[PDB]
């Protein structure tokens, strides 16, 4: 486990019908603990999650406690098949590149 | 001057192909004689796409991958079926990790 | 409960030493279920969380399953006390204004 | 032309105050005679800040709130202690939700 950080995660696109390339790729995923004070090499917490963690530290059961989620994404050049024609197009938000607590 | 430090691939895109993968590398001067070669910017992996019909096989796309993903460690091109656009056509794709490895494959039984 | 949506949440700034105004304010928080397909009035899912949910629907235990988190924030004009001088300054990321699944 | 549809507050900021809340409303023409009034853009809530010393009380800030938060439903200004900058000074703040309600308070025992 550990603090909130970026972890490798393979995603399979052979399930997707039209995708030719890639077939599997590294999409990654954010995972870890959102401690207070923070101990992670991610950018500093936003004020909102800071106030959430400080409410929780004073004994407040948050309905949705802070979560380790991606804060930045990168695209991928997907080669897919539309009708019977091959299309190489950029698809955004395919890879998680940065993590944070929110 | 010196040997290429980056991966070089066969580059080809049939007229029926929409879009391009040329942004994934830099086209080399091949002596202005076919086929083109491309030096990859973001990976050490070449890819190849073939359209397999009744009795023939047409190359559709050849070029660079945008990243090193599982399957790229292959030294040679071993295509596997990826699409069935029509009952008489099957699209096979291969990825490999050596120079010009996407040129062709051994055989598709 | 329900789907991923924005819920009211009061935050107390009287715990913070220097803050004069506000003392309590609506910071809100994102809470709900990240179903697949989505059924919420939030913007459409990003491709990354879509692929996560489709992995999970095929029977894959995600180490960090999709989370309902804020995707947009708004600031607040805080009146605080630095040294013995009063300062009115804008502080960003004080209010969650939009939700999403990541 | 017609009565104001938005909340109006007393506006004042002592010289020692850094920053301003004037961006939270629009200053009205008060006859160029003291004190200023401000019509709020984002709330129906006025606020007041007082510095309470040994025997006297100085108004430090008066103006608009940036949103309607708990405590704004008060019809009049009832200040409560918020800061202790020095052993001889206490900063009291009040918020209320009627026109010019931040002008002054009844008493602070
Ligand atoms: C595959 O080849 C057939 C026969 O030439 C053609 O009709 C079909 O459009 C081709 N498919 C692709 C995806 O290029
Ligand atoms: C409060 O008044 C005292 C006495 O005039 C002054 O020294 C002090 O700086 C004031 N505090 C603030 C926050 O203005």
Numbering used by the authors:
A (entry chain A), C (entry chain A): 459 to 560
B (entry chain B), D (entry chain B): 16 to 124
Sentences from the study reporting this entry:
Anti-Müllerian hormone (AMH) plays a crucial role in male sex differentiation and female reproductive development. AMH is a member of the transforming growth factor beta (TGF-β) family, which consists of over 30 unique, secreted ligand dimers, divided into three classes based on sequence identity and receptor utilization: TGF-βs, bone morphogenetic proteins (BMPs), and Activins. Remarkably, AMH has evolved within this family to be the only member with its own dedicated type II receptor, AMHR2. To help resolve this question, we solved the crystal structure of the mature C terminus of AMH in complex with the ECD of AMHR2.
Diffraction quality crystals of the AMH/AMHR2 complex were obtained, and the structure was solved to 2.6 Å resolution by molecular replacement. The asymmetric unit contains one AMH monomer and one AMHR2 ECD with the biological complex being generated by crystallographic symmetry, including a disulfide bond that connects the two AMH chains. AMHR2 binds to AMH using the concave surface created by the palm of the receptor, which binds to the convex knuckle surface of AMH. In addition to the central palm–ligand interface, AMHR2 wraps around fingertip 3/4 of AMH through extensions in both fingers 1 and 3 of AMHR2. First, at the center of the interface, there are several hydrophobic residues within the palm of AMHR2, including F62, I64, M76 and L106, which bind to corresponding hydrophobic residues on the knuckle region of AMH (L478, I479, L535, I537, L539, I544, and A546). Second, also centrally located, an unstructured loop within finger 1 of AMHR2 extends toward the interface and creates a short β-parallel interaction with the top of finger 4 of AMH. This positioning facilitates the formation of main-chain hydrogen bonds between residue R33 of AMHR2 and residues I544 and A546 of AMH. Here, a salt bridge is formed between AMHR2 residues D81 and E84 and AMH residue K534. Comparison shows that the receptors are shifted by about 7.5 Å, where the AMHR2 position is shifted toward finger 1/2 of the ligand, while ActRIIA and ActRIIB bind Activins and BMPs toward the top of finger 4. Overall, the structure shows a modified Activin/BMP type II receptor-binding mode, in which AMHR2 is shifted downward and wraps around fingers 3 and 4 of AMH.
